[PDB]
Design a protein around this ligand. Structure first.
Ligand SMILES: CCCCCCCC(=O)OC[C@H](COP(=O)(O)O[C@@H]1[C@H](O)[C@H](OP(=O)(O)O)[C@@H](O)[C@H](OP(=O)(O)O)[C@H]1O)OC(=O)CCCCCCC
Ligand SMILES: CN(C)S(=O)(=O)c1ccc(S(=O)(=O)N2C[C@](C)(C3CCN(c4ccc(Cl)cc4F)CC3)c3ccccc32)cc1
Ligand SMILES: CN(C)S(=O)(=O)c1ccc(S(=O)(=O)N2C[C@](C)(C3CCN(c4ccc(Cl)cc4F)CC3)c3ccccc32)cc1
Ligand SMILES: CN(C)S(=O)(=O)c1ccc(S(=O)(=O)N2C[C@](C)(C3CCN(c4ccc(Cl)cc4F)CC3)c3ccccc32)cc1
Ligand SMILES: CCCCCCCCCCCCCCCC
Ligand SMILES: CCCCCCCC
Ligand SMILES: CCCCCCCC
Ligand SMILES: CCCCCCCC
Ligand SMILES: CCCCCCCC
Ligand SMILES: CCCCC
Lengths: 457, 457, 457, 457
C-alpha cells in the first residue's frame, strides 16, 4: 500500500523507470498546445473579417448621414441652433434617399416589418416631446405633463420637409432605417459571403434641455445565410475533428487518472480509520484544470463548426471559449515542471502565499471599495476618469501601479477657479489614496509574497 | 478589577461567550454600510443632474456667442487683428439679440438689478483703458496715468455698433448678461425642476498688451425655486430618516462605550496611584472614528433633505459630507478584524511604523519644499507643468512615482535653442530630483514600513 | 605549472609587477572606444541625409497627389462617395501631369521599363475587379467568379478621364509612377549627390467592400550613382583605415591570448589525467566578445567605405553593424573592472543569478505566451493595442512595467454597450494578467537577483 | 584638549547647557529661509512679466505674418507648391506693411543699422542659392558650384512683388525686420515699463531640396530703458538689503566657525604627532554649503537690484542664482536634525552608501553610454525620441523608470513594413535594454542603498 502510494506520487520519468510506462499524456499536451493554438489562429481570420465588416460599415454610415462629421468627433458632435438641427435631420434623410447614386457600397432597402415602420416604409423619422409643455422662465413658471408623445413620419425608399419641431418640450428626435449588404471579403478566406442587415439609429438627444443637442449614430448587425448563393469553383472541418479527438482522448485519460486517485484515497482513508484537508491530497488539481480545458475546447470547436456551417453567428462567445481554452492549455503544461524544485519556484511560492494574501485582501478591500464609491459619486461629475464605477476602479488600480497620475491631478486643475471646495477635496482624496495604497498596502502585499518565497527558498 | 479589564478588552465573540452579549454594534455597522452607500448613490443622481445642466449650458453659450469657437480651443482662443476683435464683439451682441430665434434652449432675459446694468438694460458692453495713455515706441517714450476708466454701453433685449476701441491703452473689454432657464431634466428623477439664472461674462483680455487678446466665456449659476410650478400627477424622505436613525443609534452606543472606557480608566489609574500615554489605552479610537462618521452622515443627510425641500442649493458641500462619511463607514468595519492577528497585518504594521515615518518625513519635507519653490519660480514661465505651486507639487509627486517623466523632459527641449542656460539648469534639476527621491528617499521610506512589518511579523 | 596558471589568471597590474608586461590591450581598448564612437557619429551624418531625403520626398508626394490630405491623417484618410473617389483619382493624375509647373522639387519622368507600364508610358492607372460580379442584396443573392481582372490605362508624361469604375465588384484601384531626383543636400557633407528614383504607388483599397475606401501613398527609393557629375572644387578614408588597423591589432592580440589559454588548458587537463565544465575556465569570454566586436567593426567599416565609394547603398545594414560594434566596444572595457571586487558587483551577481533566472523563465514563458495568443485573437479586433502578436507582446510587457495601463482599460470602455461579453472578458483578462505578473512573477524574478547579490555580497 | 574637542562636537542644545550659548545661527537659518523664499517669489513676478511679454508677442507675430498658421502646427508648417511659397512670402511682406492698421499691438519700425538692412530699409527679403546650379535628373547629371550667393531686396516701412525664385538651386529664403514696443503690463507690478526691440526672422528652408519647404518664425528680444518715461504718481530695495544683511551675518558666523574648526584641527594633529582622511573631520561640510548659499544669494540679490535699476536685463541668470540659493537654504536646515539619530536616517544612509554606489556607477555608465550612442545613431533617423543625444538619454532614463514604454515601442511599428531589419534591431535593442537595466542594474542599485540602511539601522 505504501509502495502503491509512492508510485502514485512519482514523476513521469520515475514512473517510466519503475514500470516502463510511456508518457502518453505529456505528448498529448504538447500536441494539444500545437493544434489548439493553430485552431485559435485560424478562427481569428473569420472573426476579424466579421468585426471589420461591421465597424467599417458603421464608419461609412457616420460619414454618409451625419452632416459635417469628422473622425474623432463622436464624443463632441452636437447641434447648437435650430437651423443646424433642421439641416442635420434633412441631410440624413436626403442621403438615405440618394444612397444608390452616391455610396461606394451596395445596399438594399428594407420596408415594413413592424414598429417603428409602417408597411412599405423604409425610414422612420420620429420626434418625442411632453404631452403638455408650457415653459415660462420669464415668470419662473411651468406647467408640464411629462408623459411622452411620439410623432412619426414615414419615408418610403425611392413631406418629411414639413417637419416642425416642438423645441421647448422636445425630448428627442430619432431616425430609424435598415440596410442590407453582402460581406464579400469572406471570399478571401475561401468562405461563402454572409448577408448582413444593419439597423441604423440616428439620435438627436435633447434630454438635458441645455441648448446643446448631441447627435449620434449606432448600428445593430444581423447576419443571415444568403438564399442560394453561387461562387464559381469554390481542411477546416478535418482539423476541427482532429482537435476534438485530441481533447477527447486527453479528457478520458484525465478522468481515468482522477478515478484512480479517488480509489487510492478511499483505500488509504479506510485503512487509516482501521489503524478532509488530508483527503484533498489525492486530487490532482492539474487534471481538473485539464478536463475543464478539454470541455471548453470541445464546446468552442462545436460552436466554430456551427458558425462555419452558418447555423450559428455568435463569434464573440466562440472566440472567448477558444481563447480561454488556449490559455489554459498553455498553462497546463506547467504540471510537468512541478516535480523539479528548481523549476517550481512560482507554484510553490503561490501555494504558500495565497492564504495570507487572501486574508490581507479581506481588510484591503473595504478601504478600496470605500474610496471607489466616494470618488465615483463626489468626483464623477467633474472628472472624466470617474464617470462610472468600473471606470473609477480602473483609474484607482492604475494609480496604485503608478500610471496616469499627473493627468489625473491635472483634470481637476480646471475646477480650482470654479469649484474650489471640490478641488481641495480632490487634492486630499488623491494624495491620501496614492500614499496609503502605493507605500503601505502594496508594500505589505509584496512582502507577503517575498516572505513566502523565503520560506520555500 | 483585573477580570473586568480583561473583559473590557475581549473580542465580540469572546464577550458573547463570557456574557451572552448580542453584537448589536456589528450588525449596526453592516446596516450602516448598506444604507449609507445607497443614500450616497441616490444623492448622486440629483448632483449629476445639476452639474450636467450647468456644464452643458456653458458649452452651448460658448458655441452660441464666441465667433468661430470649436471644442478644445479654450486655452488658445484669441484675436490678433482689430477686425477680428470687432467681429467677435459684434457677433456676441448680435447673438444675444437673436437668441429667441436661433437657440435650441429656452431662455428669458434679465434687466436691470444693479451694476454693471442700468435699469431696463439686459447686456452691458464695457471697455476699460488707462486714464492717460500716450505711448510712443518710435521715440522710446510714454506718458501714462494708469488709473483705469470704464466706459459702458447698455443694450436692451429685443448703437453698440458705434463702439470705438482705444487700442493703444485698452485694458480689456467685457460683455455681461444674465439668462433664465428651467432645468427640466429633473423630471426624470421625479423631482420638481428648479429655476436657473446664468450670469455670463465674456472677456477680451488685453492686460499683456502683446498683440494677442485671449477671449473667454464664464458662467455663474444661481438656483431658485420656481414660482408655483405645476407637474401633472407628480421614498427618499423615509430612507433619509432611516439613515438618521441608524446613525443616531450607532452614535449613542459608541458614546456609551466611550463613557464606559473612561470610567474604567479613571478606576484603574486611581487604583494604580494607591498601590498619560498609558491613559490613552482605554480610548477606543475606532469609536471616535465611528462617532465622527455618524456626525458627518447626519449633517449630510440634513443638508440633503434641505436641498430636496429646496431650502438649500449647496450640492458640493453635501456631496463631500456624504462621500467622506461613506468612506469612513466602509473603513470603520476594520475594527472587527483587529482581534485576529492573521487579518490585522495592515493596522499592526501602520501602528508600529508611523512614528519613524513621521520623523523621516520631517527631514524629507524641507528638501521637497526647496525643490518645489525652485521649480515653481525658475521653470514655471517656461514649463506648462510648473505654472503654479500646487501644479509643481503634483508634477514632482508624479515624478517620484515614475509617471509622466519623458514628457516633462521633452517640454524643455524647445528652450534648448532659445534659452540654453535654462535648459541646462532644467536638466540638472530634473535628473538630480528624480535620482535623489526615487532611488534614495523612497527606498528608505519603503524600508521603514517593511522593517515595521518584519517586527510585527 | 601552478605558478604559470597563477600568472595566467593575474590582473594587468599584477602581471606588470611580475613581468613588467606593458598593458597594450587596455590602451588599445581605450583607443578603440574613442575611434569607433567617432566613426559611428561620422557615419550618422550620411545615414541621416539619406533617410531625411526619402521621408521628406514622401511627405511632399502625399501633399502633392492626395486631394485634401493633411498631416496626421494617414490612418483615417479615406473616400466615402463615388464623387470623392473620382475626384481623388483625377486629382492625382492631374498633379502628376502638372508636376513640372507646381512642385518645389525638381523631378524627371520615367517611361516604360516593364509592367505595369507599357513602353513610353509614365503613369499606370489600374482597376482590379472580379471576373463575374453579380451582387443582389435585395434578393439576398449573388453570383461571383472571384478571379481578379486588371484593367490598366496608360498616361504618358507631358483619355484617363473616361475611367468608369465597376463599384459593385471593384477590388482596388492603383496608380503607379516613377520620378527621378538628385539628393543635393549631400553637398553639405562634402559628398557627391546621388541619383534617386522614387517608385510611387497610390492605393484606393476596396477589399472590405464596406462603403469606406482607404487611400494611401507609398514610395520605394532606389539609389544610383549619377552619370559623370561635376562639383566645383570638391579624411574619412584615412580614419576608416585607422579603425581597421586598430581593430585588426586587437583581434590578433585576442587570438594570441585565446591560443595561449587553450594551450594552458590542454597542459593542465593532460597533467590532471596523469595524476568539461572545468575545461571552460581557461576560455576568456571577454576575448570572445572582443574578437566578435572586431569582426563586426571591420565588416561595418568595409561596408561604409563601399557606400562612400558608391558601390553599395545598404545604409541600414551598415548602421546596425557599426552601432552594435560600438555598444560591444563600450561594454568590453568592463573586463578590466572584474579584477576588483568592489567594482564587479554587477557581473558577479549576473553570473550567480542567470541559471536560476533561466529556470524561472522556463515556467513563466508558457503563461506569457498563452496570454499573448488569447489577447491577440480575442481582443485584437476590438483593441488598437492588440492588432498583431508583436504589438500584443509590447502591450503586455509595458503593462508588467506599470506603463500605459489606464488607456489600455479605457480602449475597451467603448465596447461596454456594444459587446458587453467582450468587455467583461477584457476586464477579467487585464486584471488577472496585471495582478499575476506584477505582484507575483516580477516579485520572484527580482527576488532571485537580489538573493544572488546577497550570496556574492 | 579632549574636553574642548568634545564641546566642539556637541549639539546646539548641549552647547547651550554647557556654556549657555545662544543658538544665533539656527535662528538666522530660519529667518534666511523665510526671507530668501519671499525674495524669490517676489522676483518671480518680474521674471514672469518679461517671459510672458516675449512669448505672447512671438505668438502674435506667428499669427500675423504666417499665411494660414494655426496653433500647434509649428513642427509641420510648410509649403509644397511654388504658388504656396510665393503667397506666403508676399503675405508676410504685406502684413509687415499693413501692421499699423491691423495689429492689436502698437509697434514702431526700425530702419538701417547694418546688415542685412541698407540705410532707410525696414525689411530685408533675401534668397540664397548656389552660384552655379545646373541640375538634370533626366540625364542623371548635374554641374554645381556650391558657393552660396545671396540676393536681397530692401523694403522701406510705409518692387518686392517682382521676386523671382531660383527654385532648382534655391538654398533658402529669409525675411528680417525689427519692431519696437513697450511692455506696459509692468505697471501692474508698480514698475516702469521697458522698451523692447524684437528682431524677427522668417525662414523658408529648402536645404533638403525634397519638395517640402518648412516655414518658421523666430524672435530675439532686446530690452532697453526708455528715454525719459513718465508714469503719473508712480519696499523691494529695503527687503533686498535685509536679505543681504542676513546672508552676510550668516556668512561671517560660518567663516568664524570654519576658522575655529581649522585651528582645533591644527592643534589636535600637532598633538598627535608629538605623542588626511582624519583631517577632514573638523571640516563642517554643512558650513561650506551655508557659505556657498550665502555667496549665491548675495550675487543674485545684487543682480536683482541691478535689473530693477535697469542696469541689467539677465533675468534667467538671476532666476537661476536665486532659485538655487533658495533650494540650498531649505536643505541647509537639515544640519540641525543630524544630532538626533531618529531624524538622521537619510543622511547617515547616504554617507554609508555613496562610495559603493559610485563604484557601481563606474561599471554601469559604460553600458549606458554604449546604449546611448547606438540608439542615437541607428534609431535616431526613424524614432522621434532618439533625434539627439540628450533626447536619447532622457528616453532611456525614463524607460528605466518604467515611463513611456509602449509609445516607444509603437513609434517603430510604422517601420515594420518599410524597414524590417531596423524594426527587428529596435525590438532587440529595446527589450534587452529594458530587461537588463530595470531588472538587474536598478535592482542592485537599490540593494546597495537598502544594505547601507541596514548597516546604519
Ligand atoms: C483499467 C482501466 C480501463 C482500461 C485502461 C486501458 C489503458 C488506457 O486507457 O490508457 C493507457 C495509457 C494511459 O496513459 P497515461 O495516462 O499517460 O499513463 C498513466 C499515467 O502515467 C499515470 O501517471 P500520471 O500521469 O502522473 O497520473 C500512471 O500512474 C499510470 O500507471 P498505471 O497504468 O500503472 O496505473 C499510467 O498508466 O494510454 C494509452 O495507452 C493510450 C491509448 C490510446 C492510443 C491510441 C490513440 C489514438
Ligand atoms: C495588489 N495591490 C494592487 S494592493 O494595493 O495591495 C490591493 C490589493 C487588494 C485590493 S482588493 O482586494 O480591494 N481588490 C481590488 C481589485 C483591484 C479588483 C479586482 C476585481 N475587479 C473587478 C472588475 C470587474 C468586475 Cl465585473 C468585477 C470585479 F470584481 C475590480 C478590481 C483587486 C485585484 C486583485 C486582487 C485584489 C483586488 C486592492 C488593492
Ligand atoms: C513617499 N515618497 C513620495 S517620498 O519620496 O519618500 C516623500 C516622503 C515625504 C515627502 S513630504 O513629507 O515632503 N510630503 C510631500 C507630499 C507629497 C505632500 C502632501 C501634502 N500635499 C498638499 C496638497 C494640497 C494642499 Cl492644499 C496641502 C498639502 F499639504 C502636497 C504633497 C507628501 C505626501 C505624503 C507624505 C509626505 C509628503 C515627500 C516625498
Ligand atoms: C521580468 N518580468 C518582465 S517577468 O514578468 O518576471 C517575465 C519574465 C520572463 C518572461 S518570458 O520568459 O515569457 N519572456 C517574455 C519577454 C517579455 C519576451 C522577450 C523576447 N521578445 C521577442 C521580441 C521580438 C522577437 Cl522577433 C522575438 C522575441 F522573442 C518578446 C518578449 C521576455 C523578456 C526578458 C526575459 C524573458 C522574457 C515574461 C515576463
Ligand atoms: C520566450 C518568451 C515568449 C516570446 C515571444 C513573444 C511574442 C514575440 C512577438 C512575435 C514575433 C513577431 C511576429 C510578427 C508580428 C507582426
Ligand atoms: C493548478 C494547481 C492545482 C494543484 C495545486 C498545486 C500542487 C501541485
Ligand atoms: C483608527 C485606529 C484607532 C486605534 C489605534 C489602533 C489600535 C486598534
Ligand atoms: C562576457 C563575460 C564572459 C566571461 C564570464 C564572466 C567571468 C569574468
Ligand atoms: C552636506 C553634508 C556635509 C557633511 C557630511 C555629513 C556629516 C554630517
Ligand atoms: C458541448 C456543448 C456545445 C455547445 C455549443
Amino acid at each position: 500500500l505504501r509502495r502503491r502510494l509512492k508510485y502514485f506520487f512519482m514523476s513521469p520519468c520515475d514512473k517510466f523507470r519503475a514500470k516502463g510506462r510511456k508518457p502518453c499524456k505529456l505528448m498529448l499536451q504538447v500536441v494539444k498546445i500545437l493544434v489548439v493554438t493553430v485552431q485559435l489562429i485560424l478562427f481569428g481570420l473569420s472573426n476579424q473579417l466579421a468585426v471589420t465588416f461591421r465597424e467599417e460599415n458603421t464608419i461609412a454610415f457616420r460619414h454618409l448621414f451625419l452632416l459635417g462629421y469628422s473622425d474623432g468627433a463622436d464624443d463632441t458632435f452636437a447641434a447648437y441652433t435650430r437651423e443646424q438641427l433642421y439641416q442635420a435631420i434633412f441631410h440624413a434623410v436626403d442621403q438615405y434617399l440618394a444612397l444608390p447614386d452616391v455610396s461606394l457600397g451596395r445596399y438594399a432597402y428594407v420596408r415594413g416589418g413592424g414598429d417603428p415602420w409602417t408597411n412599405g416604409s423604409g425610414l422612420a423619422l420620429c420626434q418625442r416631446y411632453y404631452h403638455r409643455g408650457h415653459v415660462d422662465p420669464a415668470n419662473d413658471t411651468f406647467d408640464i405633463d411629462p408623459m411622452v408623445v411620439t410623432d412619426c413620419i414615414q419615408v418610403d425608399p425611392p413631406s418629411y420637409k414639413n417637419l416642425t419641431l416642438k423645441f421647448h418640450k422636445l425630448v428627442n428626435v430619432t431616425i430609424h432605417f435598415r440596410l442590407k449588404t453582402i460581406n464579400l471579403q469572406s471570399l478571401i478566406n475561401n468562405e461563402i459571403p454572409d448577408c448582413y442587415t444593419f439597423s441604423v439609429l440616428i439620435t438627436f438627444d435633447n434630454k438635458a434641455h441645455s441648448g446643446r443637442i448631441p447627435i449620434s449614430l449606432e448600428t445593430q448587425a444581423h447576419i443571415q445565410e444568403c438564399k442560394h448563393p453561387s461562387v464559381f469553383q469554390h481542411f477546416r472541418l478535418l482539423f476541427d475533428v482532429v482537435v476534438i479527438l485530441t481533447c477527447s482522448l486527453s479528457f478520458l485519460l484525465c478522468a481515468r487518472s482522477l478515478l484512480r486517485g479517488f480509489l487510492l484515497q478511499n483505500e488509504f482513508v479506510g485503512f487509516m480509520w482501521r489503524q478532509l484537508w488530508e483527503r484533498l491530497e489525492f486530487v490532482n488539481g492539474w487534471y481538473i484544470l485539464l478536463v475543464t480545458s478539454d470541455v471548453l475546447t470541445i464546446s468552442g470547436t462545436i460552436m466554430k463548426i456551427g458558425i462555419e456551417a452558418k447555423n450559428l453567428a455568435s463569434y464573440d462567445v466562440c472566440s472567448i471559449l477558444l481563447g480561454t481554452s488556449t490559455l489554459l492549455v498553455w498553462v497546463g503544461v506547467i504540471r510537468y515542471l512541478t516535480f523539479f524544485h528548481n523549476y517550481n519556484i512560482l507554484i510553490a511560492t503561490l501555494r504558500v502565499a495565497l492564504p495570507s494574501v487572501m486574508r490581507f485582501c479581506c481588510c484591503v478591500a473595504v478601504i478600496y471599495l470605500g474610496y471607489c464609491f466616494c470618488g465615483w459619486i463626489v468626483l464623477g461629475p467633474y472628472h472624466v476618469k470617474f464617470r462610472s464605477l468600473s471606470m473609477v476602479s480602473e483609474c484607482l488600480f492604475s494609480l496604485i501601479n503608478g500610471d496616469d497620475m499627473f493627468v489625473t491631478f491635472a483634470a481637476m486643475q480646471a475646477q480650482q477657479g470654479r469649484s474650489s471646495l471640490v478641488w481641495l477635496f480632490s487634492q486630499l482624496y488623491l494624495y491620501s489614496f496614492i500614499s496609503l495604497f502605493i507605500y503601505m498596502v502594496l508594500s505589505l502585499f509584496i512582502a507577503l509574497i517575498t516572505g513566502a518565497y523565503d520560506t520555500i527558498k
